[PDB]
Design an enzyme around this catalytic site. Structure first.
Site, PDB file in Angstrom:
ATOM      1  N   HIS A   1      44.052  46.975  41.998  1.00 48.67           N
ATOM      2  CA  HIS A   1      45.394  46.453  42.329  1.00 48.67           C
ATOM      3  C   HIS A   1      46.254  46.497  41.070  1.00 48.67           C
ATOM      4  CE1 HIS A   1      43.855  42.423  40.832  1.00 48.67           C
ATOM      5  NE2 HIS A   1      45.136  42.367  40.516  1.00 48.67           N
TER       6      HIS A   1
ATOM      7  N   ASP B   1      38.287  47.018  44.771  1.00 48.92           N
ATOM      8  CA  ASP B   1      39.373  46.708  43.828  1.00 48.92           C
ATOM      9  C   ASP B   1      38.965  47.319  42.486  1.00 48.92           C
ATOM     10  OD1 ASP B   1      41.600  45.820  42.517  1.00 48.92           O
ATOM     11  OD2 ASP B   1      41.324  43.703  42.910  1.00 48.92           O
TER      12      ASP B   1
ATOM     13  N   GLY C   1      47.131  37.601  35.504  1.00 52.90           N
ATOM     14  CA  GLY C   1      47.206  38.395  34.245  1.00 52.90           C
ATOM     15  C   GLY C   1      45.771  38.702  33.758  1.00 52.90           C
TER      16      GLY C   1
ATOM     17  N   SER D   1      43.366  39.755  35.672  1.00 53.63           N
ATOM     18  CA  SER D   1      42.778  40.785  36.554  1.00 53.63           C
ATOM     19  C   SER D   1      42.463  42.032  35.745  1.00 53.63           C
ATOM     20  CB  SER D   1      43.827  41.245  37.574  1.00 53.63           C
ATOM     21  OG  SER D   1      44.133  40.125  38.407  1.00 53.63           O
TER      22      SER D   1
ATOM     23  N   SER E   1      39.059  40.547  39.795  1.00 57.25           N
ATOM     24  CA  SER E   1      39.885  40.914  40.943  1.00 57.25           C
ATOM     25  C   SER E   1      40.836  39.740  41.304  1.00 57.25           C
ATOM     26  CB  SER E   1      38.985  41.078  42.190  1.00 57.25           C
ATOM     27  OG  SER E   1      39.875  41.519  43.264  1.00 57.25           O
TER      28      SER E   1
END
EC number: 3.4.21.12
Lengths: 4, 198
Positions: free
Chosen positions: B36, B63, B141, B143, B159
């Site tokens: 993502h 992801d 932030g 991720s 994720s």
């Protein structure tokens, strides 16, 4: 839940 | 730029994510991150300098992504822990109950334990299946950042989770946190990558  | 797990990078001069792990694909240098975070060909920058572009990603469903970098970047087998570093030694997958830490640009380095595997997150975009759940806290932030054991076994990339109004799940008790990561193993085999270790 959320992305991040 | 020196590529280390946990540091911030921006995508197309808009979004921020964290670096997961330095990897190689034959002579190509790269890093794995969350899918993502960007679309294929989006531009990644570190400290305002272009370092590479998204080469592939899967999101939602899964992801994951990898960014191929320019030859000028320096890959390092390390994950940021404050001003110190954790050495990446491999990717043995830890079991439920093992302790694990994660590193990212928003909450820094946080530790907890793995509580469940094969979890489904129902994100606005679509379900993401097969995630592993830990109770180390995380924020918007973080991720794409590294999940690793203190022994250096890389577990996966961040994720998402049950973000509260302050943008993280750090002000709620460990027992109530759901912080999810994408397993690294399937990302390495899906793109033919090798982890950089030290």
């Amino acid at each position: 839940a959320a992305p991040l | 730029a020196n590529i280390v797990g946990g540091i911030e990078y921006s995508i197309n001069n808009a979004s921020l994510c964290s670096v997961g792990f330095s990897v190689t694909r034959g002579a190509t240098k790269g890093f794995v991150t969350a899918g993502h975070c960007g679309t294929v060909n989006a531009t990644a920058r570190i400290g305002g300098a272009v370092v590479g572009t998204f080469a592939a990603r899967v999101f939602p469903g899964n992801d994951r992504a990898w960014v191929s970098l320019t030859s000028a970047q320096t890959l390092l087998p390390r994950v940021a822990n404050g001003s110190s570093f954790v050495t990446v030694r491999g990717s043995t997958e830890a079991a439920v109950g093992a302790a694990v830490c994660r590193s990212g640009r928003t909450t820094g380095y946080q530790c907890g334990t793995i509580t469940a595997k094969n979890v489904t997150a129902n994100y606005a975009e679509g379900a993401v299946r097969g995630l592993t759940q830990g109770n180390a806290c995380m924020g918007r932030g973080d991720s794409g950042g590294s999940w690793i054991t203190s022994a250096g076994q890389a577990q996966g990339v961040a994720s998402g989770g049950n973000v509260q109004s302050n943008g993280n799940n750090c002000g709620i008790p460990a027992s109530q946190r759901s912080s999810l990561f994408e397993r690294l193993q399937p990302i390495l085999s899906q793109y033919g990558l090798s982890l950089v270790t030290g």
